[PDB]
Amino acid sequence: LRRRARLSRLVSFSASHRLHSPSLSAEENLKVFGKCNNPNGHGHNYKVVVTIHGEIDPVTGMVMNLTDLKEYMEEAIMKPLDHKNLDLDVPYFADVVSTTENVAVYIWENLQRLLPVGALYKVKVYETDNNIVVYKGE
Amino acid sequence: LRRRARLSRLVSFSASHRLHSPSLSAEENLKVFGKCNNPNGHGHNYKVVVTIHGEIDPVTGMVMNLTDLKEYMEEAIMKPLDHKNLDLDVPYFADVVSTTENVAVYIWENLQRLLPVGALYKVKVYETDNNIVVYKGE
Amino acid sequence: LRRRARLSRLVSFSASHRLHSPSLSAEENLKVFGKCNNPNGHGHNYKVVVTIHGEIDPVTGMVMNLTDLKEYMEEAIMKPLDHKNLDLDVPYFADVVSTTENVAVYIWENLQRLLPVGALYKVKVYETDNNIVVYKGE
Amino acid sequence: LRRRARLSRLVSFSASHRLHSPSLSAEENLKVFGKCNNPNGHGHNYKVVVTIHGEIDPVTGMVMNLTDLKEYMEEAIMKPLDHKNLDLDVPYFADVVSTTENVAVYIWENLQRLLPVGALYKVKVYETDNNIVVYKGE
Amino acid sequence: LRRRARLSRLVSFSASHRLHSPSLSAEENLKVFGKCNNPNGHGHNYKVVVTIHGEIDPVTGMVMNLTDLKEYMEEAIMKPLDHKNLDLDVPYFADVVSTTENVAVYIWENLQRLLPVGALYKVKVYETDNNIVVYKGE
Amino acid sequence: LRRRARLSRLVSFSASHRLHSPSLSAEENLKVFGKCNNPNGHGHNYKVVVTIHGEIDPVTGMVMNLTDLKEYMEEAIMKPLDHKNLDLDVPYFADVVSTTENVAVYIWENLQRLLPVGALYKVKVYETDNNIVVYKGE
Ligand SMILES: [Zn+2]
Ligand SMILES: [Zn+2]
Ligand SMILES: [Zn+2]
Ligand SMILES: [Zn+2]
Ligand SMILES: [Zn+2]
Ligand SMILES: [Zn+2]
C-alpha cells in the first residue's frame, strides 16, 4: 500500500466587495452587515490555502505535481477573482452575498470541476489575518 | 440542505503567570517546570483562535455574525484574561496549573457557556509562536 | 476521565537538495521536476510542526513535558537534517526522492521510533511559506 | 468530564409502497425500478435502529431515559409510518420517491424535530435483511 | 506500510441486576427506572462485541491471534461477569448504577488493562436485542 | 447540495480454506493456527456486507441502483469465491494466508476495480457469527 498525505498550496488575490442582500431592507442590511455594507464597498487581500490529498507516488514522491496544482489554482481562483470586484465582475455573486463563507464555497466548486475525483480536501480562506473560513465540502 | 463551514476569529491578550503545582515540592516543581517556575513569574502575548461551525445562512451568507462572535470572545477571553496575572487574578487558576493546556480548557468552558449548543468546534492557543495547544472538548 | 488535547512544537532547519529520480531519464526528470532538478541543487529553510496528543496530566497540567518533546525533536529532526544536503548526507534519501512529502514521512518514522505509543498525531512541513505537506501516518 | 456513549433502540414497522418517479415515463420507471415499480405496490417489515449520543449521566447512568427515547420513536416513526402505505398515507412521500434512503432521511428529520439539539447520531433502516441505509445528517 | 483492519469477536454472558440509585429516594427510583427497579432484580443474556484494530500481520495475516483475543475476553468479561448478579457480585457496581452504559464502560476499562496500547477500538453491548450501547473510550 | 447516505447490500458465499503459512515450519503453523491448520481444510458460510456511500439522487432517490450493486457483487465476490476452496481455487491466496482479514482485503480490491471512484466505503466479512473483520481501505 502507498502512503497518503495532504499537499497544500497558498495563493493570494486582491478584490473588492460590499456585503448586501437585496432580499433585505436597506435598514436591515446596515444592521446585519454594518460597515461591510458601505455603498461604495471596501476590499481585502485574500489568502487562500487549497489542500489536496492522495497517495505519495512511489517514483515521483509527489501527491500531485506542483505545476498542475499551480495551474488549477490559476484557473479556479486567480483568473476569475484577482483584482476584481466580487459582486460586480463575477456572475456567481450576482445572487449570492460575497461573504468569506461564500467565497470559500465558490472556490471549492470551481476546483471540484477541475480536479480529479476525490483529490480536494479543504479550502481555507483568510479574509483578513483574523478572519478565516474553512470549507470541506459539507 | 444548507452548506456547513467553519468560521474562525483570532484574538490576542497579554498575561503573566508562573507554572507551579502546590501539590509538589519546591524541588520537584523546579525540576518539572524549570524556568517557567520563576517565583516572580514571566509572561506571554497569547494568540487565541476560536472556531465555530454551522450552516451558512441562505440569506445572510454567514455561519455566525462576526459581531456576535466578537462579543462572545470579549466576554469569554479578553475580559477575564487580558492584562492579568493568570494565577493571581483569575479564580479558575487558583487550583489549576496555568499551562497553555489549561488556558485552552478554561477558554473552551467559558465559550461553551456563552455559545449556542454545538457551535464551538475548536480552541487553539499559541503561548508563543512555537508553542501551540489545540483543545476540541475531548 | 482526564481531558485530552493536542500539543504542538515548531522547529526549523536549513537544508539542501535536488529532486531527481534515478529511475527516470535525464529528460523525464527535467520534465517532472523542472527547476528543482538543478544539478547543483538548491535549498530551503524548512519549518516543521510536530503534534502530540494525549491526556492533560491532572497535577502537572501538561500533555507532555516540553523538554522531552524538545529533545525528541532534536534527535529526530535537527540532528540528522539541519545544515545537511538531504540526498547526500542522510542515508534515507539515497533511494527516496527528497520531496517535502518524503521529508514529512521520514520525520514521522523517526519520531515514531522515539515517542511513546500513540502520542504522535501529525507532522506538518513547510518547504516554503506557500508549500505545505501534512502527514498523519496514513 | 463525563464519559460519552451511544445509545441505540431498535423499532420495527410494517408498510407498503411503490417505487415510482413522476418525472420518468412509464417505460423509464419500469427500467429503473423493475419489480419495485409493480403498480399495486409491495411491502416490507422495516427495521429501524435509532442511535443517540451524549454523556452518561453521573447519577442515573443513562445517556437518555429509555422511556423518553421510546416516546420519541413512537412519535417520529410508529405513528406516521406503521401499517401505512408510504406513497399515499404520508404527505412527505407525495413528491418524494419512497426509497429506503428517503425513508431514512424522513425519519432523521422527524427525529431532529423532537430530540435535544446534538443528541441524534445515526438512523439505520433495514428495508429487508439485505438492503440497509444509514443516514447521519450528511 | 501494512494495511490496517478491525477484528471483532462476539461473546455472550448471563447476568442479573437491578437499576437503583442510592442518591434517589425510593419514589424517584421507581419513577426514573420503572420496572428495572424491581426490588428482587431481573436479568439478561448480554451479548458483547469487542473490536480491535491494528495492522494485518504480513506473515500470519492476522490483526491479532484469535486465541489471544479469546483469553483476553475470558478474563475481562466472562470471569467477572458470567452468571453473576451485577450489583452484588462485582465491586465496581457497588457504587455505580448497572446500566448497559456502565457495563460497556466497565468492560472497556477491564480490556484496556489487558490489551496492547492502542489496540482496543470499540465495545458494543446488547442488553436485549433492542437496547444497545457502544463505548469508544470517549 | 444533495444529501449523502450509505447503502449496504449483504451477500453470502460458501467456501473452504486452510490457514497455513509456508514461511512457518509445520510445528509453528500448528502452534499459530491450531485447528484452522487442519491439513484437509475446513469451511464457512461467509456473510459479506458491502457499504457504498454517495449522494441520494434527486430524481430516483437512490445512492446507487441496487441492480448495479448486485452485478458488482456477483462479479467481485460470488464468481471468484462461491463454492470454491480459497487457497487452491483463487490465485490471490496462492501466496496470501486466507484469514478473514485477507478475504476482506481481497474483496475490497476486487470492488475498487469495478466501482466508481470514491463509492466504496466499507467491506464487512463474517467468517462465523462470532469472527468479523471490517476493512475500510486503511
Ligand atoms: Zn469584507
Ligand atoms: Zn509560560
Ligand atoms: Zn525544493
Ligand atoms: Zn421496496
Ligand atoms: Zn435491565
Ligand atoms: Zn476458518
All three cell numbers of A122:
479543504
Residues 6+ apart with CB under 8 A from C106: C90, C92, C93, C96
Catalytic amino acids of F? 36, 83, 127
The owner of cell 494495511 is E3
Resolution value, angstrom units: 2.3
- Closest-CA distance, F117 to chain A, in angstroms, reads 7
The secondary structure of residue A77, as a DSSP letter, is I
Q: What residues are neighbours of ligand 2 (ion), with CB under 5 Å?
A: B 36
Q: What is the identity of the amino acid at D23?
A: S
The radius of gyration computed from the CA coordinates of chain E, to the nearest angstrom, equals 17
Q: Which residues contact B6 (CB under 8 A, 6 or more apart)?
A: A133, A134, A135, A136, B51, B52, B53, B63, B121
| Ligand nearest to the Cα of D61, by number | 5
User: Of B42, B64, B61, B41, which Cα lies nearest the Cα of B51?
Assistant: B64
> Is F17 annotated as a binding-site member?
yes
φ/ψ of residue A120, rounded to 5 = -65, 130
Binary contact (E2, A3; C-beta < 8 A): no
Q: Where are the alpha helices (DSSP H) in chain D?
A: 26-33, 66-73, 79-81, 86-89, 100-114
**F53 labeled binding residue:** no
What are the grid coordinates assigned to B135, written together?
483543545
Annotated active-site residue B75? The verdict is no
Cell of F45: 458460510
Fill in the amino acid letter for C95: D
Experimental technique behind these coordinates? X-ray
H or E, element range at A123: strand A120-126
Active site residue E36: yes
Q: Which of A69, A68, A91 is nearest to A81 (CA)?
A: A91
Under DSSP, the state recorded for E35 is: G
Number of D–E residue contacts, CB under 8 Å: 59
Q: At what angle do helices B66-73 and B100-114 cross, to 10 degrees?
A: 130
Amino acid at E30: L
Residue that has been written with the C-alpha cell 496544482 in this structure: A69
Adjacent-strand bridge partners of D21: none
Measure the CA–CA gap between A26 and A15, rounded to whole angstroms. Answer: 24
Q: With beta carbons less than 8 A apart as the criterion, state whether C21 and C29 touch.
A: yes
CA distance F97 to E62: 9
Annotated binding site of B for Zn(2+): 17, 42, 44
D42 alpha carbon – ligand 4 mean position (Å): 6
Rounded CA separation C104/C100 (Å): 6
User: Using CB atoms, which residue from A19, A21, A102 is nearest to B56?
Assistant: A102
Counting as contact any 3 or more CB pairs under 8 A, the partners of B are: A, C, D, F
Sign of the torsion formed by the C-alpha atoms of D26, D27, D32 and D36 = positive
Give chain A's contact residues with F (Cβ, < 8 Å): 117-118
The DSSP result for chain C, as a single string, is: ---EEEEEEEEEEEEEE----TTS-HHHHHHHHGGGG-TT-EEEEEEEEEEEEEEPPTTT--SS-HHHHHHHHIIIIIHHHTTEEHHHH-GGGGTS---HHHHHHHHHHHHHHHSPTT-EEEEEEESSSSEEEEE---
3-state secondary structure of D96: coil
Angle between the N-to-C axes of helices E100-114 and E66-73, in degrees from 0 to 180, rounded to the nearest 10: 130
Task: Identify which of C56, C53, C37, C47 has the alpha carbon closest to the alpha carbon of residue C107.
Answer: C47
3-state secondary structure chain F: CCCEEEEEEEEEEEEEECCCCCCCCHHHHHHHHHHHHCCCCEEEEEEEEEEEEEECCCCCCCCCCHHHHHHHHHHHHHHHHCCEEHHHHCHHHHCCCCCHHHHHHHHHHHHHHHCCCCCEEEEEEECCCCEEEEECCC
Residue C7 is placed in which grid cell?
Answer: 500539543
Q: What angle do CA B73, B78, B83 make, to 5 degrees?
A: 165
Is B113 within 8 Å of B46 (Cβ atoms)?
no
Residue C83 appears among annotated catalytic residues: yes
C-alpha cell at D55: 454523556
Q: Which residue has the cell 491448520?
A: F37
Catalytic residue of the set B36, B53, B75, B101: B36
Q: How far is the CA of A112 from the centre of ligand 3 (A)?
A: 28
Please, what are the domains in chain C?
Answer: 1-138 (3.30.479.10)
Asked if residue E82 lies in contact with residue E76, where contact means CB atoms within 8 angstroms, the answer is no
H/E stretch holding E7 reads: strand E4-17
> Which residue, among E20, E87, E101, would best test binding to D if mutated, counting the most D CBs under 10 Å from its CB?
E101
Cell triple for C101: 512529502
Centre of ligand 2 to C-alpha C65, Å, is: 13
Q: How far is F4 from chain B (nearest CA, A)?
A: 10
B3/F2 Cβ within 8 A:
no
Task: Please tell me the distance in Å from D58's CA to the nearest CA on chain C.
Answer: 12
* CB-CB neighbours of F73 under 10 Å: 21
DSSP D39: T
- Identify whether the C-beta of residue D6 lies closer than 8 Å to the C-beta of residue D55: no
Q: Is A97 helix (H, G, I), strand (E, B) or coil?
A: coil
Give the dihedral sign, CA F38/E71/D4/E56. negative
List Cα–Cα distances, C106 to B85, C47, C99, C115, F84, in angstroms: 42, 14, 11, 14, 43
CA atoms of A137 and A108, how far apart (whole Å): 7
Q: What is the DSSP letter of E94?
A: G
Q: What sign for the dihedral angle of Cα A67, A70, A76, A82?
A: negative
- From A28, A55, A74, A83, the catalytic residue: A83
Interface test with B, best of C2, C55, C59, C62 (most B CBs within 10 A): C62
Q: Can you tell me whether residue B19 is helix, strand or coil?
A: coil
Residues of D contacting chain B (CB within 8 angstroms): 117-118
Distance CA(E10)–CA(E48), nearest Å, equals 6
